[model samples]
Target: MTYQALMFDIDGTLTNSQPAYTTVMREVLATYGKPFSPAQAQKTFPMAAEQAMTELGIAASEFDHFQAQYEDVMASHYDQIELYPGITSLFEQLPSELRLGIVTSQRRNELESGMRSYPFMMRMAVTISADDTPKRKPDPLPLLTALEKVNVAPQNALFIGDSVSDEQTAQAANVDFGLAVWGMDPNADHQKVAHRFQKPLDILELF
Candidate 1:
């Protein structure tokens, strides 16, 4: 591997929560006065529930109104959502020579709660969350902070994610970006971004 560390986007990138996510989103949207069919819910992939809500005219900051239920539903989703293809083995087979990190848009507590079951959780150098600071993805602060904290240079790291925003975020952070195409984001229609992986094993092979 050319990089010293691998930084990942948690949701669609590492875990296949589409099914549960779509289900929960349907329920949440109904509460927000917008109801989307499974197809419409699927179209919101790689975007957080808040973004999906706001885009439909609900304010994202009305977080308190939906957080508890959203958290509850998402937790249930994580429990049943399939791990992305070969994710478990990918973690098991990682070379002892590199470091790992998680840079995500999800809230910290929510992300940590879901990741408690993953094998490599502790080895992660940092888990920068959506609320970590003012800057979010497409802004670069979180990723830059993670690399700085880990002493991993931008050129010496790889940020693998599911959305074009992730690609743009990586660029703003001045690091390499690898797309996880299996994540199926409707927003990611343009830009080659970086290499796209169909499965976790494909990423392992690149190493």
Candidate 2:
């Protein structure tokens, strides 16, 4: 089926900043006396930041503090974040008839700051950040909201992201989910996706 719109997730999907992110996350966790391996952060971050912290035994009451620290770290080194090579051209070359949007768990402040560095993202027709939804990923509200704004049918749109929650969100929203399995490895849910792009440019095939 032809798609009229494409929605993407930010971190692991569009950007290759996992290494920088993992490094900073490790620092924050250690500062809190909850050290974890870089590999663990890479695997766990896409699920949910709070969830990852909780799994590492961070007290629930500390989530706000932990998140503030995490964002501070990210903001300080925001330039360290890099877009996967060729994604810029891919975004530029998408057909004009197709609408694009971003559905990210990142909060508005951080997402706004980060997107400002990448002019290509500014072209997106809609963006739904963590602040835009009370029901987060693994729930469909965000994706559904994006679809509503874009005025596209669920079956005519695709949500591409790099985590299990992304796939679940798409499924729950009744939209096709594509796997961005480059900077991050796929989870068990990877096999279930009918759309999988090993590289950023590979997504052009969907056109």
Candidate that scores best on TM-score: 2
lDDT of 1 by residue, 29-147 (tens): 67878877767666666655556666657775776777677777776667677677677788888776777889988887788778866777867777888878788787788899889
| Clashing pairs for predicted structure model 1, backbone only | none
Listed per candidate, the RMSD to the true structure in angstroms reads 2.2, 1.5
Model 1 TM-score is 0.88
Q: Native-vs-model 2 lDDT?
A: 0.84
Model 2 C-alpha RMSD to native: 1.5
User: Model 1, poorest ten-residue lDDT window?
Assistant: 47-56
> What digit string (tens of lDDT, one per residue) describes model 2 on residues 72-181?
88887777888888899988888888889999999999998887668797779999999998989979999999999999989999998888888889888999988887
lDDT of each: 0.77, 0.84
Taking all chains together, the TM-score of candidate 2 against the true structure is 0.94
